[PDB]
Design a protein around this nucleic acid. Structure first.
Lengths: 191, 178, 127, 141, 75, 137
RNA sequence: AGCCACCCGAGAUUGAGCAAUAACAGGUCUGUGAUGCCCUUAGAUGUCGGGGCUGCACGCGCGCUACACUGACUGGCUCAGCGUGUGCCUACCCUACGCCGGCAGGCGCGGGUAACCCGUUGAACCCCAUUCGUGAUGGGGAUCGGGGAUUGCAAUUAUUCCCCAUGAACGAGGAAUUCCCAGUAAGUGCGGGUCAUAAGCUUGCGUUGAUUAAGUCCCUGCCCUUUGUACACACCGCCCGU
């Protein structure tokens, strides 16, 4: 443990952080070697505290939405650590590294901001932040988890693991691959 | 499925979609010339001028004569156009689809006439009846070759589509019934 | 206008006590017997100093001939559950605007007099 | 030691079997049909919770100086689902929870003691620490 | 909205398939079993306990919401 | 994997594997989820299981218990009607007979023209709670 | 003058208290023995009884529960904080415990105006084992039933609780609309108040606890000028002609 700290049941090591912009917004083993994702119970104290929070801890944060599910991280970290188990038995890979790849293919490249042109709808081909690229990755990952479980035999962990695996390698069966591309569609589009 | 042997629309394919439900940016509209395949519209480019209204009594279930900009044959996203449309008037494709609904519905039981609908072995149902016209070149060819069939009394039992049941209990009455 | 096998085709027990036996009973038994809301009326309300009206209930029953109903016994109170000695009186029940005269029968035992008198419309709006 | 050193959820089930090893745990005449709590939408699945509840009571009274009827009624209940109204914590039946208490007093697992109610029996201090070791040697959660 | 029902009967045709779909099984939750079969999801649990009793599959999670099984130790 | 037991009838309904046994008993009147919890436990039947199992011979005993509540120690208070206005002792009423007695109460309350009947007949709410905005739309 | 950075850290980061100028036909005579003018005045407008303030084709607001699996179930584990509470001048507690009753509740006392008892306040969320399996399903609890406690002198017009049972919309909510940057949102219970009984009211509290601006005047409003004004009660101003 003082040599290397791993995940609660997985390894923070053997994690392939393989994007260009998303360096040091995705870290699980670099400074963020955590068996237990919980920093202090707040993550909006600073704008800096976004990159302080790792993607494994923000996933436990960005899940508890939907007011009956708000204020429940203990249900969440249960279901989140359940979801890593459902990754590995479907993959065999490090389920953190699957989650780490899930941020990669779900992060956009160019998006669009609104602009006006002659009354007609045009949108400006802009980059988004690699902070936002992670935040557009996680939020689309967190959307398909509770939604697909909401009237199905599958729990959120089974839907979130399918959400991570199909976004670890873009299969267009996770919600995050399917909605990133519509964001990236408008950049090469209008004007 | 569909009476087209081809699965998907092509580039600049003027297609007749089905407005199922209106969505966030637009509506996930599903083609009916090709089977049930979903396509999308606005935000980007469907309209040309600005008068700022969409409906008064137009409730649901519409059909849009739209032109395929982008088609994702793997992923499943068909981007559609009407802003580009100067010549692709909606009346021609729908009246063709008003035929091509019946052209499909003639060729999808079949299953010597009860009719059922549904279902036979769906892909093999059309290679024997529906796509064998689409195989029969050209595409203006089976615009007339299918019309040769449902001109039923001019004549009934001539050139092939001798496939497959025999077919002929359908070919007498179920063409006139469908 | 009196007790059982008369104004009763609705037979056996209203709440747990048969009206056929109840009219042969006293109501000091009925408050003990299967009449909880009446029990809270007859034990906590406990013969609630309407005695001059209760005399009048037994006066007008006596003053009228017993083959006929009493003349008039008006009350302001509408919280009165019909007792077996009450059964037969044509009781004027006041709803805060009007006296409603109700002959009280073996079927109506266990019911308050504000249940036959109304303070409220079958609401219209032009309806 | 205490019984707080060993696994409490194993403890409420190993002592429940120990109250089945007692053979009697003085069940009330009404568990097949009862509400048993205004918290519960359903009647219990069985009657063998009553051993577990007393296995949850004798563990509770091992730690106290003594408690009784009102103290058990806040332990096993929770949010009373108020339907169309907001749910709130309250206390269910005070008879079967007292029936638990008179049982463990009758078996001398707990016993009427100081601090207003039932504290551990020293035999119970044995038999809890006996099955605490049975809890501890088996598994340690 | 949604209206789905599995077969809410203990089903041999599903369970004999479950004993024979088992090399495809490595992530074995009862919901996966209730979707790979038409077993209920409630009755998927008890059927997998029988398939656990065969020793073909192995518990890797046991939570009060849902258990997870896994066919032989690594694959 | 035990298929072959799937026909049951609890009065005027078919009781197959659709839910748990007791919750499938709830298809009829006079039998809620807790009352069906009891009658199977008066019959000592695991209501956890499926009504596509557990054949009618257990259920024919359950028929005798739902018809005889106090006789099988389903006590006086647990009943849908305690100390009734018709059959004046403590009767748990069942599938088709409760729909009688729910009417037989209220049709009596209009012959008596008591306040329960007067509210229920006049389009009004039986309860004295507010009906200005609710009980309508 | 100030900023940024970091040190320390409780950092240059808590939340309120609080109000200038001026304005108000803001609201209150029904808070006021603050009230002018009146009204009526023994036939009251000083009273009691009864009833309506609750009524519903409906218009609107605020709440609340719902729409399942972080949910329902059955239980089990166990963690608060704010306060408060009988002995009070128009009417009175917290309750251990002991007991009975499924419960409703009954009940026996005793403690305690109180960091002394209630109350080692061992709350809920949580947490686990389940059953359930996403099925208007057991989610939902509308509605109503029978009956029982309970408060009251009186509940009937269900005061309230309970018991089972009848078992509804609702499977996510248009037009619109609301709020808000950390213990915040939300979720959760709890204390205080109105009371004889009688909350979905309310003020507090802790608790579990998110994503997100971290910017801007874009919306929008506010301050700051210039400019023009036919406005001056001031653009909902003016103001034309048919």
């Amino acid at each position: 443990t003082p040599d290397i700290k791993l995940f609660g049941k997985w390894s923070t090591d053997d994690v392939q952080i393989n994007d260009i912009s998303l360096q040091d917004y995705i870290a699980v083993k670099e400074k963020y070697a955590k068996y237990l994702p919980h920093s202090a119970g707040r993550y909006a104290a600073k704008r800096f505290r976004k990159a302080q929070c790792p993607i494994v801890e923000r996933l436990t944060n960005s899940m508890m939405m939907h007011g009956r599910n708000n204020g429940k991280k203990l249900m969440t970290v249960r279901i989140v650590k359940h979801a890593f188990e459902i990754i590995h038995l479907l993959t065999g890979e490090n389920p953190l590294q699957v989650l780490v790849n899930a941020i990669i293919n779900s992060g956009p490249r160019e998006d669009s901001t609104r602009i006006g042109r002659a009354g007609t709808v045009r949108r400006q081909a802009v980059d988004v932040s690699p902070l936002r690229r992670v935040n557009q990755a996680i939020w689309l990952l967190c959307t398909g988890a509770r939604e697909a479980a909401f009237r199905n035999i599958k729990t959120i962990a089974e839907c979130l693991a399918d959400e991570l695996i199909n976004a670890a390698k873009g299969s267009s069966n996770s919600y995050a691959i399917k909605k990133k591309d519509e964001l990236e569609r408008v950049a090469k589009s209008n004007r | 499925c569909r009476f087209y042997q081809h699965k998907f629309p092509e580039v600049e394919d003027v297609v007749m979609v089905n407005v199922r439900s209106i969505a966030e940016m637009g509506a996930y509209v599903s083609l009916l010339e090709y089977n049930n395949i979903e396509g999308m519209i606005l935000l980007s480019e469907l309209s040309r001028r600005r008068i700022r209204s969409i409906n008064k009594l137009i409730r649901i279930g519409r059909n849009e004569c739209v032109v395929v900009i982008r088609v994702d044959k793997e992923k499943g996203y068909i981007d559609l156009s009407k802003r580009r449309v100067s010549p692709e008037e909606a009346i021609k494709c729908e009246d063709k689809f008003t035929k091509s609904k019946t052209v499909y519905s003639i060729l999808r039981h079949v299953a010597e006439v009860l009719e059922y609908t549904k279902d036979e072995q769906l892909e093999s149902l059309f290679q024997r009846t529906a796509w064998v016209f689409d195989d029969k070149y050209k595409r203006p060819g089976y615009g007339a070759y299918d019309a040769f069939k449902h001109a039923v009394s001019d004549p009934s039992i001539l050139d092939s589509l001798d496939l497959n049941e025999d077919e002929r209990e359908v070919l007498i009455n179920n063409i006139n019934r469908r | 206008v009196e007790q059982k096998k008369k104004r009763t085709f609705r037979k056996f027990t209203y709440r747990g006590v048969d009206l056929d036996q109840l009219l042969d009973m006293s109501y000091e038994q009925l408050m003990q017997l299967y009449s909880a809301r009446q029990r809270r009326r007859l034990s906590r309300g406990l013969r609630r100093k309407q005695h001059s009206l209760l005399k009048r209930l037994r006066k007008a029953k006596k003053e009228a001939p017993p083959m006929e109903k009493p003349e008039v016994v008006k009350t302001h109170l509408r919280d009165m559950i019909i007792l077996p000695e009450m059964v037969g009186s044509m009781v004027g029940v006041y709803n805060g605007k009007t006296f409603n005269q109700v002959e009280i029968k073996p079927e109506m035992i266990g019911h308050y007099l504000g249940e036959f008198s109304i303070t409220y419309k079958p609401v219209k709006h032009g309806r | 030691v205490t019984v707080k050193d060993v696994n409490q959820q194993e403890f409420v089930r190993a002592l429940a079997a120990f109250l089945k090893k007692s053979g009697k745990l003085k069940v009330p005449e009404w568990v097949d049909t009862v509400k048993l709590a205004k918290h519960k939408e359903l009647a219990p699945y069985d009657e063998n919770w009553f051993y577990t509840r007393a296995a949850s009571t004798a563990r509770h009274l091992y730690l106290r100086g003594g408690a009784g009827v009102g103290s058990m009624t806040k332990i096993y209940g929770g949010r009373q689902r108020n339907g169309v109204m907001p749910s709130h914590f309250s206390r269910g039946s005070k008879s079967v929870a007292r029936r638990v208490l008179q049982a463990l007093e009758g078996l001398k697992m707990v016993e009427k003691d100081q601090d207003w109610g039932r504290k551990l029996t020293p035999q119970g201090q044995r038999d809890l620490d006996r099955i605490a070791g049975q809890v501890a040697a088996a598994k340690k959660k | 909205r949604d209206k789905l029902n599995n077969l809410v009967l203990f089903d041999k045709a599903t369970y004999d398939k479950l004993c024979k779909e088992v090399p495809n099984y490595k992530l074995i939750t009862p919901a996966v079993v209730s979707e790979r079969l038409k077993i209920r999801g409630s009755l998927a649990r008890a059927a997998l306990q029988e398939l656990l009793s065969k020793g073909l599959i192995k518990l890797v999670s046991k939570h009060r919401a849902q258990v997870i099984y896994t066919r032989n130790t690594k694959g | 994997p035990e298929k072959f037991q799937h026909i049951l009838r609890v009065l005027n309904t078919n009781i197959d594997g659709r839910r748990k046994i007791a919750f499938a008993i709830t298809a009829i009147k006079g039998v809620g989820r807790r009352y069906a919890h009891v009658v199977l436990r008066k019959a000592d039947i695991d209501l956890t299981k499926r009504a596509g199992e557990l054949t009618e011979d257990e259920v024919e005993r359950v028929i005798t218990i739902m018809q005889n509540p106090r006789q099988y120690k389903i006590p006086d208070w647990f009943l849908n009607r305690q100390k009734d206005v018709k059959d004046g002792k403590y009767s748990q009423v069942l599938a088709n007979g409760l729909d009688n007695k729910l009417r037989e109460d209220l049709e009596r309350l209009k012959k008596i023209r008591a306040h329960r009947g007067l509210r229920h007949f006049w389009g009004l709410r039986v309860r004295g709670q507010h009906t200005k905005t609710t009980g309508r739309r």
